Write a protein that holds these residues in place. Structure first.
Motif, PDB file in Angstrom:
ATOM      1  N   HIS A  31       5.106   4.377  -8.205  1.00 50.29           N
ATOM      2  CA  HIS A  31       5.449   4.200  -6.971  1.00 50.29           C
ATOM      3  C   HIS A  31       5.981   4.762  -6.660  1.00 50.29           C
ATOM      4  O   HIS A  31       7.151   4.731  -6.393  1.00 50.29           O
ATOM      5  N   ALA A  49       8.632  -4.217  -1.081  1.00 50.43           N
ATOM      6  CA  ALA A  49       7.048  -4.430  -1.289  1.00 50.43           C
ATOM      7  C   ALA A  49       7.161  -5.383  -2.840  1.00 50.43           C
ATOM      8  O   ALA A  49       6.673  -6.019  -3.349  1.00 50.43           O
ATOM      9  N   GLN A  69      -2.042  -3.019  -7.767  1.00 53.91           N
ATOM     10  CA  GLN A  69      -2.264  -2.756  -6.375  1.00 53.91           C
ATOM     11  C   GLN A  69      -2.663  -1.383  -6.014  1.00 53.91           C
ATOM     12  O   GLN A  69      -3.272  -0.769  -4.805  1.00 53.91           O
TER      13      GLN A  69
HETATM   14 CL   LIG Z   1       3.257  -2.091  -1.619  1.00 51.52          CL
END
Ligand SMILES: [Cl-]
Ligand SMILES: [Cl-]
Length: 162
Positions: A31, A49, A69
């Motif tokens: 990420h 986040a 996600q």
């Molecule tokens: Cl995010």
């Protein structure tokens, strides 16, 4: 083998902020937090986040949470993109996973520059596409990963990952 396992292999898992291969601030399982050089910016993106004051470190569950996600956003990005969708719809399950892999890593944009290869894919010209895919900064910068992806598309099997 599925997309989750496949990506978890390619990206790895780290619970503390780290720099990716382009030097960008990342965490968890690939990420990207920010393309900015500022570590504080990163920490800030991070808190936003996760929804909390992390101080640059997260738990495994949080990482997994980011990862779900992110995989989900990647598919949907595909489904949303007019030149990609049809390519993706034309393929089998394994090869779809290979495209998700590339979109995860490089964003819709990044993946959008493989126009030619993608035509080839649509026409199911596996070997040609594989060679086209290799004439890329992508392959030149992260060769082992690129290789696994490429084989996957060339072969339609999970061999490169077993
Ligand atoms: Cl995010
Ligand atoms: Cl690599």
């Amino acid at each position: 083998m599925n997309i989750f396992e496949m990506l978890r292999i390619d990206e790895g898992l780290r619970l503390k902020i780290y720099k990716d291969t382009e030097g960008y601030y990342t965490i968890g399982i690939g990420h990207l937090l920010t393309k900015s050089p500022s570590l504080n910016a990163a920490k800030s993106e991070l808190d936003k986040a996760i929804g909390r004051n992390t101080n640059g470190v997260i738990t495994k569950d949080e990482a997994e949470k980011l990862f779900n996600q992110d995989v989900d956003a990647a598919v949907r990005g595909i489904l949303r993109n007019a030149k990609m969708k049809p390519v993706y719809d034309s393929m089998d399950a394994v090869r779809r996973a290979a495209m998700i892999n590339m979109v995860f890593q490089m964003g819709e944009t990044g993946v959008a520059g493989f126009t030619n290869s993608m035509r080839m894919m649509q026409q199911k010209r596996w070997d040609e596409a594989a060679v086209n895919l290799a004439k890329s900064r992508w392959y030149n910068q992260t060769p082992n990963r690129a290789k696994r992806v490429i084989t996957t598309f060339r072969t339609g099997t999970w061999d490169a990952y077993k």
